[PDB]
């Protein structure tokens, strides 16, 4: 059971082996594949998987908030597993590009702010807005 | 891509979806400085001829509901819009009671500038909301 497949099972989504292959490809990918790469890797596994099935499945994984479709800085639609906790966002105000980041350091300070006011931190939303240097 | 206008930034603060029409309307509002709906609509249609006055009205109303815009009658009877005040404090929210605890953290702000810097950016704004339950 791949992470993406596990996510599908939680959503009560219909799964078949072709959808499982696509889920596995997305889960095993070291990069953030575009649809062409998902297709190439999925058909390398089972050549019966059509390009249409790949588009349909990735879109479904999007619509069920299992995958995020994201521009990592190349203007391409690339796919990533939607994380267990939301990534923080740094927005380029000149282009509207979103840089997703994680900061265990900021998280530690967030916990301290919650603790000092007598709270357990249960979540956060952080947006940063920047202009390119 | 597009420039993130000052009003679009307020939308992003709220986690609102930036549809093309909302982006255009946010940009027009940002470039205006107390338009009525007709002025917003005329300016929005200069950018996207297919935007309707209904869409403009509904969008400015939504922005008002989310405290992005304020609406006032300055005497001429027209509802006129302006950017709502924004908070200087970040918020810790007790989710059980829906109560706000204001805080400022120069420390966390220094870290935010460091993140921006590391990615090749100067920080021009931020919003932080923390969600908590009592210990």
Residue numbers in the entry:
A (entry chain B): 2 to 134
B (entry chain A): -1 to 31, 33 to 134
Provide the publication's sentences verbatim.
In most bacteria, iron homeostasis is regulated primarily by the ferric uptake regulator (Fur). Fur, which was first discovered in Escherichia coli, is a global transcriptional regulator that directly controls the transcription of over 90 genes involved in iron uptake, storage and metabolism. Several holo-Fur structures have been solved, revealing a modular domain organization including an N-terminal DNA-binding domain (DBD) and a C-terminal dimerization domain (DD). In this study, we present six crystal structures of apo-Fur, holo-Fur, Fur in complex with the Fe2+ transport protein (feoAB1) operator and the P. aeruginosa (or E. coli) Fur box.
The apo-MgFur structure was determined at 1.55 Å resolution. The results showed that apo-Fur is made of two monomers that form a stable dimer, with both monomers consisting of residues 1–134 and nine disordered C-terminal residues. Each monomer exhibited a modular architecture, including an N-terminal DBD and C-terminal DD, connected by a flexible hinge formed by residues 83–88. The dimeric interface was primarily formed by the DD, which was composed of two α5 and two β5 that formed intermolecular hydrophobic interactions and an antiparallel β-sheet, respectively. The buried interface comprised 1,628.4 Å2 per molecule, indicating a very strong interaction between the monomers. Overall conformations of the two Fur monomers, especially in the hinge region, differed greatly, with an overall root mean squared deviation (r.m.s.d.) of 4.6 Å. However, their DD and DBD conformations were almost identical (r.m.s.d.=0.9 and 0.4 Å, respectively). Analysis of the crystal packing of the apo-Fur structure revealed that the DBD is stabilized by other DBDs and DDs from symmetric units. No absorption peak of transition metal ions was found by X-ray absorption spectroscopy, suggesting that the metal ion-binding sites are not occupied in apo-Fur. In this study, we solved the first apo-Fur structure without transition metal ions and found that apo-MgFur is a transition metal ion-independent dimer, providing a structural basis for further studies of apo-Fur.
